[PDB]
Design a protein around this nucleic acid. Sequence first.
DNA 1: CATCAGTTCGAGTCTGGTACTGCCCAGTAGTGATCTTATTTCATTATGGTGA
Length: 52
Amino acid sequence: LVEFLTPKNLITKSFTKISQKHLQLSRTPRVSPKSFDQYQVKDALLAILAGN
DNA sequence: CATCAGTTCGAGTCTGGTACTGCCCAGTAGTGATCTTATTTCATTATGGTGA
C-alpha cells in the first residue's frame, strides 16, 4: 500500500501479473431501489404531524 | 446499428458527533454480644543455717 500511495514509484512499473489473476466474477447486488414518492410520504408525515 | 464504456440520479447502509431515561445496590461507620488470647496475680512448695 505504501508504494502504491506514492505516485512517483507507480510511474516506473511494468505490472504483468495483474492480467493473470482474477477471482471476482459473481457478486450479489443490492436488494432493490424501492420506490419513494415525495408527495405521498410528505402527506403521511403531515397527517402524523397532525396526528396527536 | 446495437454493444460496450464513460456519466448521473437517487436510494441503501454505517457511523460518528451529540444528548438523555428508568431504575436499588454497595460500602462504611455506630452499637451490643460473645468469645479469645499475650500477658499479670494468688496461693502452695522447696531450700537455706543456727540459737535454745
